[PDB]
Design a protein around this ligand. Structure first.
Ligand code: 7ZO
Ligand code: 7ZO
Ligand code: CL
Ligand code: CL
Lengths: 4, 124, 124, 4
C-alpha cells in the first residue's frame, strides 16, 4: 500500500 | 482525496480476468477470425480496443454473442493481441510483426501500433 | 517467452472498466445492501472478491441479476470497497475503518483486511 | 514498454  | 492505493491491484485484477478466460467462465462473446473462434469478455475487449468499444456501445451490436472480423484479419495476429489484452504481454516477433501491427490498427490499440512502428523502424 | 510488456496496460484496463461502470455500460448485476443498490460487472467483482468469485461460479447463482448481501453489511463500507475494486484506491478513515474491515472480511478481500488490521493496530 |  502507498500514498498515491 | 486521502485514499491509500494497493500497487498490485490492477495487475491482480487482470490476472484473475485472464484465469476466468482460461476456464471459460462468464465469457459472453465469440470473436470469429477467418473461421477461428475466440471466446472473451466484452468488457475486457472494450477496455483494450477502440473497435470493440464502438461495437459493444452500439445499441444493436451490444446484444450480439458472435462478432465476425474483417476477412483480411489474421487469426494468429488476433490471438497475440487477445493474449496482450488479458496479460499486458505482447509476443512480438520478426515473423508476426506485420500481422500484429495490421490487427492492432484495425482493433484501434494505439500503444501496440506505436511499439510495432518503432520495432519496424529499428530494422530498416 | 520473449514477450515485451506495456507497464501501464493493467491500470488503463481498470480505468476503462471504471468508466464503463460510471456510464452504466454492460453492467450485469445489482448488489443490494440494506436497500441501497449498486450496479457492477460480475467479472470485476469476481476478480476482486473471494465471495463474489464463489457466488458467480455457482451454476444457479451465476445467472442471477440481483444479489442480496447479509443485512449486517453497511452500504457505505460496501461503496468504499466497490470503488477500491474499480480504482485500486481505498478511502480508509477513522470513521469508516471498522465497517470497511467487516465488509472486506465478508467479501474475502484479503489485502484490504490486512491494511485495516495494521491501521487499527497503529491506533491502539 | 519493458522486458518483463
Ligand atoms: O487504443 C485504444 C484503446 C481504447 C480503449 C477504449 N475503451 C474505453 N474508452 C473509454 N471509456 C471506456 C472504454 Cl471501455 C476506447 C478507445 C481505445 N483506443
Ligand atoms: O482476497 C481475495 C481476492 C480474490 C479473488 C478471487 N478471484 C479469482 N481467483 C481465481 N481465479 C479467478 C478469480 Cl476471478 C478469488 C479469491 C480471492 N480472495
Ligand atoms: Cl494498446
Ligand atoms: Cl484485496
Amino acid at each position: 500500500w502507498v500514498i498515491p | 482525496d486521502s485514499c491509500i492505493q494497493f500497487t498490485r491491484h490492477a495487475s491482480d485484477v487482470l490476472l484473475n480476468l485472464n484465469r476466468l478466460r482460461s476456464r471459460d467462465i462468464l465469457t459472453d462473446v465469440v470473436i470469429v477470425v477467418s473461421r477461428e473462434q475466440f471466446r472473451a469478455h466484452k468488457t475486457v475487449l472494450m477496455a483494450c480496443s477502440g473497435l470493440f468499444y464502438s461495437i459493444f456501445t452500439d445499441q444493436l451490436k451490444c446484444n450480439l454473442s458472435v462478432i465476425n472480423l474483417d476477412p483480411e484479419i489474421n487469426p494468429e495476429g488476433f490471438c497475440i493481441l487477445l493474449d496482450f489484452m488479458y496479460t499486458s504481454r505482447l509476443n512480438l516477433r520478426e515473423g508476426n510483426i506485420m500481422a500484429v501491427m495490421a490487427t492492432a490498427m484495425y482493433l484501434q490499440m494505439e500503444h501496440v501500433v506505436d511499439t510495432c512502428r518503432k520495432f519496424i523502424k529499428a530494422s530498416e
